[PDB]
Amino acid sequence: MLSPSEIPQRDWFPSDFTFGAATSAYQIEGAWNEDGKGESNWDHFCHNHPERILDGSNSDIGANSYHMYKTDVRLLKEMGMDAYRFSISWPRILPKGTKEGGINPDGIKYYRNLINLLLENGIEPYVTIFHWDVPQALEEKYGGFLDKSHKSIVEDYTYFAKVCFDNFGDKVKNWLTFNDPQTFTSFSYGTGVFAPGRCSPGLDCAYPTGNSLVEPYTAGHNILLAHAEAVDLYNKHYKRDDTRIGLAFDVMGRVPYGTSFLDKQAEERSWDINLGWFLEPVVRGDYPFSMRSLARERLPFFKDEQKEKLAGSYNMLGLNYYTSRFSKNIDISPNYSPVLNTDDAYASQEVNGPDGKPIGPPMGNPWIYMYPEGLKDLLMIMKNKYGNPPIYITENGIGDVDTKETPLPMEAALNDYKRLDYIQRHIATLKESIDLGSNVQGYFAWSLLDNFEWFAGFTERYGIVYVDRNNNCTRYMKESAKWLKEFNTA
Amino acid sequence: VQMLSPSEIPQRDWFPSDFTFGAATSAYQIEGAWNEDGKGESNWDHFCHNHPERILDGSNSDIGANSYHMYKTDVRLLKEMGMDAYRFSISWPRILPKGTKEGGINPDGIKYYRNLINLLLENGIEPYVTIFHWDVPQALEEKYGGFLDKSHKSIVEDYTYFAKVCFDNFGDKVKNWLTFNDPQTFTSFSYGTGVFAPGRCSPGLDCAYPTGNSLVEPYTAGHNILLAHAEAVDLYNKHYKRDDTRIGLAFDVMGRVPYGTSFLDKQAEERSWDINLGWFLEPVVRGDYPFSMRSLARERLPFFKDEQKEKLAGSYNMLGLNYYTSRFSKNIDISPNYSPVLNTDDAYASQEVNGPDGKPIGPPMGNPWIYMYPEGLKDLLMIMKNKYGNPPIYITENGIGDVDTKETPLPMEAALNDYKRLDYIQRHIATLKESIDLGSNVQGYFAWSLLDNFEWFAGFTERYGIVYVDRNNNCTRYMKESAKWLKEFNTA
Ligand SMILES: N#C[C@@H](O[C@@H]1O[C@H](CO)[C@@H](O)[C@H](O)[C@H]1O)c1ccc(O)cc1
Ligand SMILES: N#C[C@@H](O[C@@H]1O[C@H](CO)[C@@H](O)[C@H](O)[C@H]1O)c1ccc(O)cc1
């Protein structure tokens, strides 16, 4: 729907700006139990609770990228992508998740080959160390990130990072410790829609014996400690002048529902519980004041030493942006009691504004509404409030619904103009944000490939590249990929 | 000393013709005749009489400025200065000796305020009447602790009746009512730090009665004040309001400026405006306390019933703002190492006179706490304008206290040449013009303290008047340079 002069041009951005595509291990790799790979929390969840996956599927094969990585690289190369962000499977590297469990040589070999091939083709690898795939051995031993000691998971995650640094550090110049920590903690232990599927008694999830008001925070605390530790290790023994490390946050833009100053306050609390939760700790060493005043004793305290390691523990930050919501105020009162950790923001997140209209056009699936302006707001907040650090939009895209009840014909799947329009608009927003002073340095189209979508299973295709699972996971560029190719190679 | 240049000095024609300039006072501070003509004992009579040690110079206001007997001269000074209005308060115990209906109305009390009001009006001076200015009848204090009334009922009904008496006897003449004045200072100082009557505070704290709870009582009192206000305004709107009459309340407020550039201090600043101004402003504006306060004080801050929120929301036609100075708000993180002691600590922010550069926010005006920072007044007005509906505003108090102690007496000559005060007054008046140009709905300015009088725990160690009171003589009044300039300004 954009005019020719509105369609982003590569020369709109600096020569050193980077464009790429991204993926996550469990979503695309497959070979879930091959070549020594250990079982992950997701293998476990999908295998034991198909009823918790919309289409009862699993990612035993995913996009088969473990075996087809060479093709994934060819595709990235043909599109002229400057970089590729992928994650490393913790259990594929450490089957038992620990040092004593030993390192899986085949796991190391796979990522080593992928990294070299990428670099061989002039593509920069942005390596995400962890993308929700916790080794089931750690889950069973101490609950994974639910580790009440704030020690075991931290040490185990740190060793995992070490193994990644030791084996790929000479080639990798860009590391991301965690990806979407907020969604991980909230969905895995709040609503329990993600593995292992825990939530408060009374709530509907596989294991309603957790605490949706506490476990998400415990896990979040351990993630931050893990991040801080991994970064301290990186800086002390692996960082080089031109290498960088950080983490990527999942974030929905927030806009005051109404004009009342109350909604502005609600909006502020929403940015805090969504973005600040993990951003403020790495920026200043502690959680947002709002969260501490609201979650109170349910939000763990950091030791002074931990605050120090946390503050400034990054050289760049990733932002995973898809949509935004209107934040509507909720007063503290005897009539309201938070149920989910996310309810601690005392604000309902609305899709429709007070005028009954969606914040932005629906992109197809249950939650993505196109609102590029939210990305700008986000970038302006990063610029003006959090020190304008180097930013990478590590994820941005939409999911095309493709269900058994309503299959998406391959032809229609390839003509993803809605996705194309969406991507172009957000890329344009970056150009605008850059001129406004934003220190954004890159954009990664989310999902190089159509793959497993967690609890949504295979009901959505997020790739810019189509994967025909019925035919040996053959990949085909969608219109979006073709435009990105043109854009990059112009 | 560094005063405004001729072109900078405010002129009356800078403001609309309907803008109002006046002076203010409070009953216990100037009246005197503490036990004359049937007047009942107040919490302050009690406090000063029983705890002289809690008053800096050990004085009391048994006489004050002897305004009960000299009100005529007070009105003369107001007239001579060409003031448009006069804000004074009514002594609850002087009107209702027992503080209750069954206790009866004191004829002499009624007569006094009636004569004062009539003399003001026959002189073309508009009376802005403050129903309550901290002087709670001791009978109510002994009966149920006054505003500490744990049932949130008795004090509400007694205040409401008091208000009724005032509306009944002076409503025909008074067109501007203020239910309360400085509720924040009253609750915080009377039950937080305990420097105000009755002098209560948490055990371990230094006050006459360290058996209270500095983290709860100030809130209880504040809650009762808000309910009292809501009930009185409801009574007023229903039976006494006329198209040309207005009612509201005045808040004591210090401007807040972020200590540093960190966003944390901006948050601290916001929390500080909330606990100082929002505490009582938000309830009358939207019907409930600031979110920050509810999130921080939690259960120590009472909840309003739905019917109460309804009565509170919009319970005013105008608001008074008592502004003197400002502070830099410095963030304090929530942590196990920090526990609030005073209700005001709930804002999680230190209030600093000096900024990161070690310099005061503004020039010191003399007493222990006033620093000249009129820009703070502008900030405050912009907040009322942009955040709270831009309601009609009256700077119901503004001035400084000239120190005058036994050890360091202030010679009458020096007391009369109050150029520090004059400069301060002129600058704030100028700030109002600037604020008006920025769209502020401010409609008046009241120089705080028509007269030198009793200054609560500071006793007579400070002269806040624009008019000097020679207590050695028979409280004879003499216009200070500030008063003389106001006269010139008003009558130009
Ligand atoms: N995960 C998550 C949330 O983030 C995005 O969810 C997409 C859905 O599969 C995923 O493809 C993308 O990589 C994630 O960044 C999320 C938000 C809302 C709902 O309903 C589910 C997940
Ligand atoms: N804040 C404060 C003080 O309460 C204002 O004080 C004025 C001085 O006369 C009074 O006229 C006005 O009504 C009040 O709003 C204060 C007094 C003493 C000390 O030690 C601290 C603060």
Side-chain angles (χ1 to χ4, degrees):
Chain A
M1 283 78 259
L2 293 175
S3 284
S5 55
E6 297 181 309
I7 306 294
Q9 296 307 99
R10 181 58 184 74
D11 58 28
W12 277 20
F13 303 80
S15 68
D16 63 358
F17 193 82
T18 135
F19 285 98
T23 58
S24 82
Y26 188 67
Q27 290 181 276
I28 69 170
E29 295 187 355
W32 80 277
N33 64 349
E34 306 190 19
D35 303 329
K37 173 172 175 303
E39 181 193 15
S40 71
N41 55 164
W42 275 89
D43 287 318
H44 197 70
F45 187 59
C46 291
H47 293 160
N48 289 294
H49 299 286
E51 73 286 347
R52 300 301 183 168
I53 305 303
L54 195 56
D55 59 2
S57 63
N58 60 55
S59 197
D60 285 359
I61 301 178
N64 204 207
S65 286
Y66 181 69
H67 296 298
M68 300 175 75
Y69 76 101
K70 289 184 184 177
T71 297
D72 294 352
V73 173
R74 180 173 66 67
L75 293 173
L76 292 161
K77 184 55 199 297
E78 291 180 355
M79 293 174 83
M81 290 296 196
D82 304 290
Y84 176 39
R85 188 181 70 74
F86 59 91
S87 81
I88 293 181
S89 172
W90 192 339
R92 192 184 296 290
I93 298 303
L94 301 167
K96 296 180 177 55
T98 63
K99 177 173 183 179
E100 67 187 312
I103 295 169
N104 182 28
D106 283 344
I108 296 292
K109 178 75 287 183
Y110 169 60
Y111 298 108
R112 187 67 192 181
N113 290 335
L114 170 57
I115 290 175
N116 289 331
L117 187 56
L118 286 164
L119 288 170
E120 176 184 352
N121 290 71
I123 303 169
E124 272 300 315
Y126 275 64
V127 186
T128 299
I129 293 173
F130 175 73
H131 192 131
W132 315 348
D133 42 4
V134 183
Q136 182 62 12
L138 303 181
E139 290 285 297
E140 312 186 324
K141 187 57 193 296
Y142 53 70
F145 282 96
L146 286 186
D147 178 9
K148 292 186 175 64
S149 77
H150 299 305
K151 306 299 298 182
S152 300
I153 187 66
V154 178
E155 169 55 44
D156 289 337
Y157 173 80
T158 298
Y159 178 72
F160 169 40
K162 182 182 183 63
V163 178
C164 291
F165 299 148
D166 281 340
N167 292 85
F168 315 121
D170 61 309
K171 293 291 183 178
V172 185
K173 298 181 178 179
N174 296 282
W175 295 94
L176 292 176
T177 56
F178 294 83
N179 193 63
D180 305 316
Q182 192 280 151
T183 301
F184 174 71
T185 55
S186 294
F187 286 18
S188 305
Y189 308 109
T191 55
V193 301
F194 279 0
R198 297 167 64 74
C199 62
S200 296
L203 297 189
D204 178 35
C205 73
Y207 301 88
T209 59
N211 190 326
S212 303
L213 250 30
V214 177
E215 291 194 350
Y217 292 119
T218 297
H221 202 70
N222 286 323
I223 283 177
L224 286 169
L225 296 177
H227 165 73
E229 204 68 13
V231 170
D232 188 69
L233 177 66
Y234 191 68
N235 292 160
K236 291 180 174 179
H237 311 291
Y238 300 99
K239 188 175 191 309
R240 301 190 290 282
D241 281 359
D242 61 349
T243 67
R244 299 172 301 177
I245 190 167
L247 66 170
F249 315 104
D250 57 86
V251 41
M252 282 184 194
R254 307 293 168 176
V255 184
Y257 181 77
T259 55
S260 165
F261 68 84
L262 295 174
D263 292 341
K264 188 65 184 65
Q265 291 178 159
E267 176 227 346
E268 289 298 331
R269 294 194 295 272
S270 300
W271 284 108
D272 282 352
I273 204 165
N274 181 193
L275 171 68
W277 186 352
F278 294 93
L279 169 64
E280 205 149 307
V282 302
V283 170
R284 81 188 185 90
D286 196 1
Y287 298 111
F289 181 100
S290 66
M291 288 185 69
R292 277 212 175 293
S293 77
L294 294 166
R296 291 202 292 312
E297 80 290 348
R298 288 188 283 96
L299 180 52
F301 280 117
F302 288 110
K303 301 177 65 61
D304 296 311
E305 59 187 55
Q306 306 175 319
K307 290 183 182 179
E308 288 305 306
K309 283 185 183 176
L310 269 170
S313 64
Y314 61 88
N315 302 112
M316 61 178 171
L317 296 310
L319 250 38
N320 301 325
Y321 180 85
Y322 294 86
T323 186
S324 295
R325 296 281 185 280
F326 290 106
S327 301
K328 191 170 175 297
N329 178 73
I330 293 184
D331 293 313
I332 289 167
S333 87
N335 300 316
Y336 187 80
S337 300
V339 171
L340 296 179
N341 58 297
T342 47
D343 295 323
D344 286 322
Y346 276 78
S348 62
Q349 310 307 315
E350 313 290 345
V351 168
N352 301 322
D355 68 341
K357 298 181 176 179
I359 188 168
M363 286 296 99
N365 68 15
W367 65 284
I368 299 177
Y369 291 79
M370 182 170 76
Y371 189 66
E373 296 106 285
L375 209 212
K376 181 176 296 185
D377 296 334
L378 172 55
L379 296 176
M380 288 306 100
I381 289 172
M382 291 306 294
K383 160 187 162 56
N384 305 314
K385 179 174 179 181
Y386 294 109
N388 196 31
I391 296 293
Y392 285 93
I393 304 307
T394 41
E395 289 184 15
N396 180 247
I398 70 176
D400 289 342
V401 175
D402 174 24
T403 63
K404 179 177 70 177
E405 299 67 54
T406 309
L408 207 200
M410 191 171 125
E411 179 176 70
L414 291 186
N415 292 309
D416 62 340
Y417 291 96
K418 190 174 300 180
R419 166 173 301 101
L420 174 54
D421 169 73
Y422 174 106
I423 287 180
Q424 296 178 318
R425 289 175 187 282
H426 287 75
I427 284 178
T429 293
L430 292 192
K431 159 56 179 168
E432 291 163 39
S433 301
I434 290 175
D435 286 1
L436 289 175
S438 169
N439 196 11
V440 56
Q441 300 296 156
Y443 172 87
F444 291 79
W446 169 248
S447 221
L448 193 227
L449 312 161
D450 283 344
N451 49 226
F452 187 71
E453 293 299 344
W454 311 110
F455 69 78
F458 284 106
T459 60
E460 290 178 49
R461 287 176 182 275
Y462 274 82
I464 49 176
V465 176
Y466 183 88
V467 177
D468 182 353
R469 293 189 253 67
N470 290 156
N471 186 193
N472 298 296
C473 278
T474 300
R475 17 234 71 178
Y476 301 86
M477 292 200 279
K478 302 183 190 184
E479 285 310 314
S480 58
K482 294 184 177 175
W483 176 78
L484 282 167
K485 173 177 179 175
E486 176 186 301
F487 171 89
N488 284 152
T489 65
Chain B
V1 185
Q2 167 54 62
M3 294 181 74
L4 305 174
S5 59
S7 56
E8 298 177 305
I9 301 300
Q11 299 300 93
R12 177 63 185 72
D13 59 36
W14 276 20
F15 305 79
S17 65
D18 71 345
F19 197 82
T20 126
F21 286 98
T25 59
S26 83
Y28 188 71
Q29 292 177 279
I30 71 169
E31 302 192 339
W34 80 277
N35 69 344
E36 302 185 14
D37 305 329
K39 176 183 171 298
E41 187 192 3
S42 73
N43 56 165
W44 274 91
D45 287 324
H46 198 67
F47 186 61
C48 294
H49 293 159
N50 289 295
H51 293 286
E53 76 284 355
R54 301 300 172 167
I55 305 306
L56 191 55
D57 62 358
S59 58
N60 63 50
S61 199
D62 289 0
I63 301 177
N66 195 208
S67 282
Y68 181 75
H69 297 292
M70 303 170 80
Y71 72 101
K72 290 185 181 178
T73 183
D74 289 349
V75 174
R76 181 181 313 113
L77 280 292
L78 291 162
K79 179 61 176 59
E80 277 174 37
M81 290 182 78
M83 291 295 200
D84 302 303
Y86 177 43
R87 188 176 78 75
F88 62 90
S89 82
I90 291 177
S91 177
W92 192 341
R94 189 182 297 284
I95 300 307
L96 301 169
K98 301 290 180 58
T100 65
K101 179 182 188 304
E102 59 191 308
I105 301 174
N106 176 27
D108 288 332
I110 295 299
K111 180 186 181 182
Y112 175 64
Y113 297 111
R114 187 69 191 177
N115 293 324
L116 167 60
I117 291 173
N118 286 319
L119 183 56
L120 287 170
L121 294 176
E122 65 189 69
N123 269 288
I125 310 299
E126 198 62 28
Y128 277 61
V129 187
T130 293
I131 295 178
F132 176 79
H133 195 136
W134 315 346
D135 39 4
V136 178
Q138 181 57 16
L140 302 185
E141 293 286 297
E142 283 172 33
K143 190 179 180 65
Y144 52 73
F147 284 96
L148 284 182
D149 178 8
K150 296 186 176 180
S151 74
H152 305 296
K153 170 173 184 296
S154 297
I155 183 63
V156 177
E157 304 183 344
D158 288 330
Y159 175 80
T160 300
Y161 177 67
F162 171 39
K164 187 175 182 302
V165 175
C166 294
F167 302 148
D168 282 340
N169 296 86
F170 319 113
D172 59 306
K173 297 294 185 177
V174 178
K175 311 169 197 60
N176 294 284
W177 296 95
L178 291 173
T179 57
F180 293 83
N181 190 66
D182 304 317
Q184 192 282 150
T185 301
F186 175 72
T187 54
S188 295
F189 282 19
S190 301
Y191 309 109
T193 55
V195 300
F196 273 4
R200 294 175 61 85
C201 62
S202 298
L205 294 191
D206 183 23
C207 75
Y209 302 86
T211 54
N213 191 327
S214 307
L215 246 38
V216 178
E217 291 192 354
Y219 290 121
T220 296
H223 199 75
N224 286 325
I225 284 180
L226 286 168
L227 297 178
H229 164 79
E231 203 68 12
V233 175
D234 187 68
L235 165 66
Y236 189 72
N237 288 159
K238 293 180 173 178
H239 304 290
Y240 306 96
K241 190 174 194 310
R242 294 191 295 285
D243 183 63
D244 66 351
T245 70
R246 300 171 301 177
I247 190 165
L249 68 171
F251 314 104
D252 56 86
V253 39
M254 281 188 192
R256 308 294 170 177
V257 181
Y259 183 81
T261 66
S262 169
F263 66 80
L264 292 175
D265 289 343
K266 187 66 184 61
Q267 292 178 164
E269 178 224 346
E270 293 296 330
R271 292 195 296 275
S272 301
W273 285 107
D274 279 356
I275 206 168
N276 180 188
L277 172 67
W279 186 351
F280 294 93
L281 173 60
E282 209 151 310
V284 301
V285 172
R286 78 188 188 87
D288 203 3
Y289 296 113
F291 181 98
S292 68
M293 289 186 73
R294 281 223 170 286
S295 79
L296 295 165
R298 289 198 258 55
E299 77 282 349
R300 292 187 279 98
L301 185 58
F303 287 91
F304 286 111
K305 302 181 74 67
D306 290 317
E307 58 182 61
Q308 300 179 320
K309 292 187 180 183
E310 290 309 307
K311 287 186 186 175
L312 273 169
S315 59
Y316 63 84
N317 301 120
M318 56 181 183
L319 296 310
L321 249 38
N322 300 326
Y323 181 83
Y324 295 84
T325 186
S326 295
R327 294 285 183 277
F328 289 105
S329 303
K330 189 172 180 296
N331 179 72
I332 292 182
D333 292 314
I334 288 171
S335 84
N337 307 315
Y338 187 87
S339 299
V341 173
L342 297 177
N343 57 297
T344 49
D345 293 326
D346 289 322
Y348 277 76
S350 58
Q351 307 307 314
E352 316 291 343
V353 166
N354 301 307
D357 62 1
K359 297 184 176 182
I361 191 163
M365 289 295 98
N367 67 17
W369 61 284
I370 303 181
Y371 292 82
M372 183 168 80
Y373 190 71
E375 301 160 30
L377 209 194
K378 180 175 297 180
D379 296 339
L380 167 54
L381 293 175
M382 289 303 96
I383 288 172
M384 293 306 293
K385 169 180 168 55
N386 304 315
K387 183 183 187 178
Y388 295 109
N390 198 24
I393 294 295
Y394 285 90
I395 304 310
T396 43
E397 289 186 15
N398 181 244
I400 71 171
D402 286 340
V403 178
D404 178 20
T405 64
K406 185 180 69 174
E407 298 70 43
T408 312
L410 208 206
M412 181 164 153
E413 186 178 80
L416 295 185
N417 295 315
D418 63 340
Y419 292 95
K420 185 96 63 58
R421 165 174 302 101
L422 176 51
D423 171 63
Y424 173 101
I425 292 179
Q426 295 177 329
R427 291 175 179 284
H428 285 75
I429 289 171
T431 292
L432 292 184
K433 173 56 171 67
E434 283 163 35
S435 297
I436 292 176
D437 293 334
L438 291 170
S440 172
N441 197 5
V442 55
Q443 301 294 155
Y445 171 90
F446 291 81
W448 169 247
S449 223
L450 191 228
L451 314 159
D452 284 345
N453 50 230
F454 185 74
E455 295 299 342
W456 310 109
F457 68 76
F460 286 107
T461 59
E462 290 175 47
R463 288 177 181 276
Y464 273 85
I466 50 178
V467 172
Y468 182 83
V469 175
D470 186 355
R471 285 184 270 78
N472 288 157
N473 215 170
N474 307 86
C475 274
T476 302
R477 291 98 159 87
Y478 304 86
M479 286 202 292
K480 300 177 186 184
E481 285 307 307
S482 61
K484 292 183 176 176
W485 174 78
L486 284 165
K487 170 178 184 172
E488 175 186 300
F489 171 89
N490 285 149
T491 66

